[PDB]
Design a protein around this motif. Structure first.
Motif, PDB file in Angstrom:
ATOM      1  N   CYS A   1      -1.892  -3.730  -5.192  1.00  0.00           N
ATOM      2  CA  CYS A   1      -0.822  -2.774  -5.318  1.00  0.00           C
ATOM      3  C   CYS A   1       0.322  -2.995  -4.280  1.00  0.00           C
ATOM      4  N   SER A   2       0.132  -3.964  -3.362  1.00  0.00           N
ATOM      5  CA  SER A   2       1.134  -4.288  -2.319  1.00  0.00           C
ATOM      6  C   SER A   2       2.270  -5.047  -2.961  1.00  0.00           C
TER       7      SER A   2
ATOM      8  N   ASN B   1       7.038   0.357  -1.879  1.00  0.00           N
ATOM      9  CA  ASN B   1       6.646   1.739  -1.592  1.00  0.00           C
ATOM     10  C   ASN B   1       7.624   2.248  -0.551  1.00  0.00           C
TER      11      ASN B   1
ATOM     12  N   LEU C   1      -2.660   6.355  -5.711  1.00  0.00           N
ATOM     13  CA  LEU C   1      -2.040   6.858  -4.515  1.00  0.00           C
ATOM     14  C   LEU C   1      -1.735   8.310  -4.580  1.00  0.00           C
TER      15      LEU C   1
END
Ligand SMILES: *[C@]1(O)O[C@H](CO)[C@@H](O[C@]2(O)O[C@H](CO)[C@@H](O)[C@H](O)[C@H]2NC(C)=O)[C@H](O)[C@H]1NC(C)=O
Lengths: 223, 62
Positions: free
Chosen positions: B5-6, B10, B48
């Motif tokens: 998910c990096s 974000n 998240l």
């Protein structure tokens, strides 16, 4: 598209669907053999569908044409989505008619406040999933750059513009990517990204097409 | 193979809310929870936002 309306038939004749088994992105026909979409929509093989009213039915008045060349912007950054623009050359020229027509590239960048039309087959709900068969439309204005930068601190480059409403409720959403934002008859945005869909203070982000007309012309000229 | 998910940008809010910013392509994936999510970034954002830890069972739709 969230909060929009069902487009009238033949209202958006430059809208295409990019299909690799099923619809995954939108795009815009700019001439008989070239489509503009988002680089993040890239796949090795793509079938371009034109003249579609309902994507789940074959009415005979659509055209399905395979991509022959797929060219992503050389400075595209897959992690930030900067330069998120791609050109697709069709295997054969589309036949233009009342259902399949082109949209003009921008003669100049759109100013803040200009009213635009966004279209697509994407999700129509903010929370949950609901994919329409019929193409949806939404009128939204271009926001100011300062307003866009303040919604996404440090995430907006000079090749991005915000279009939508700070109050949320109306926006483009998953399945709309690559699709058009047309203002005064000129393609000024490509559906790209956002924080969710239709969230307050978080309008959609779109590729700023007016930055890319010279690159488009050079690429097309040589291919 | 799971997922990273990096790979998605974000941003942190004022009160520490971490927000994952997602592309608007429809590339459905099937979660380990048996739910079909619109694309991988959206599955990342769901984990998240909800605090879950759903993984990707497979790239297609369940
Ligand atoms: C969020 O903060 O974005 C950053 C940037 O992608 C993520 O940071 C990175 O990618 O995290 C990975 C390990 O998960 C690490 O190997 C990278 O170096 C690191 N990059 C930086 C600049 O720190 C971060 O994980 C992410 N947060 C979440 C919860 O997704």
């Amino acid at each position: 598209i969230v909060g929009g309306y069902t487009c009238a038939a033949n209202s958006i004749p430059y809208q295409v669907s990019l299909n690799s088994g099923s619809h995954f992105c939108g795009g815009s026909l700019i001439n008989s053999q070239w489509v503009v979409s988002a680089a993040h929509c890239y796949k090795s093989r793509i079938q371009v569908r034109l003249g579609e009213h309902n994507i789940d039915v074959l009415e005979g008045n659509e055209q399905f044409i395979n991509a022959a060349k797929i060219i992503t912007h050389p400075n595209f950054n897959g992690n930030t989505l900067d330069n998120d623009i791609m050109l697709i050359k069709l295997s054969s020229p589309a036949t233009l008619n009342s259902r399949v027509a082109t949209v003009s590239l921008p003669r100049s960048c759109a100013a803040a406040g200009t009213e635009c039309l966004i279209s697509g087959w994407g999700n129509t709900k903010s929370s949950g999933s609901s994919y329409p068969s019929l193409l949806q439309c939404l009128k939204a204005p271009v926001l100011s750059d300062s307003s866009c930068k303040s919604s996404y601190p440090g995430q907006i480059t000079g090749n991005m513009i915000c279009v939508g409403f700070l109050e949320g409720g109306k926006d483009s959403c998953q399945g709309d990517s690559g699709g058009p934002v047309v203002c005064n008859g000129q393609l000024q945005g490509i559906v790209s990204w956002g924080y969710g869909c239709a969230q307050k203070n978080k309008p959609g982000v779109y590729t700023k097409v007016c930055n890319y007309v010279n690159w488009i012309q050079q690429t097309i000229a040589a291919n | 193979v799971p997922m990273d998910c990096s790979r998605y940008p974000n941003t942190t809010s004022e009160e520490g809310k971490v927000m994952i910013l997602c592309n608007k392509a429809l590339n459905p994936v099937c979660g380990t929870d048996g739910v079909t999510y619109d694309n991988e970034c959206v599955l990342c954002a769901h984990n998240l936002e909800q605090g879950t830890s759903v993984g990707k069972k497979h790239d297609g739709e369940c």
